[PDB]
Amino acid sequence: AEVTSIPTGCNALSGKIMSGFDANRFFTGDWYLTHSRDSEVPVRCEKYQTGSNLQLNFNGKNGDVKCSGSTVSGNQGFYSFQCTTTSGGSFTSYMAVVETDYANYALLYRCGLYGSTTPKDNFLLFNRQSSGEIPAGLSTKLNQLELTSLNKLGCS
Ligand X SMILES: CCCCC/C=C\C\C=C/C=C/C=C/[C@@H](SC[C@H](N)C(=O)NCC(=O)O)[C@@H](O)CCCC(=O)O
Site string (42-81) toward ligand X, x via CB under 6 A: ------x-------x---xx---x-x-------------x
Q: What is the C-alpha separation between 98 and 123, in angstroms, rounded?
A: 9
Size of the site for ligand X (CB under 6 A): 21
- Exactly one of 34, 93, 100, 127 binds ligand X (CB under 6 A); which one? 93
Nearest to 92 by CA among 101, 84, 81: 81
When the beta carbons of 65 and 155 are compared against ligand X, the nearer one is 65
What is the smallest separation between the CB atom of 6 and ligand X, expressed in angstroms? 12
What is the smallest separation between the CB atom of 154 and ligand X, expressed in angstroms? 13
Which H or E run includes 130? Answer: none
What is the smallest separation between the CB atom of 19 and ligand X, expressed in angstroms? 20
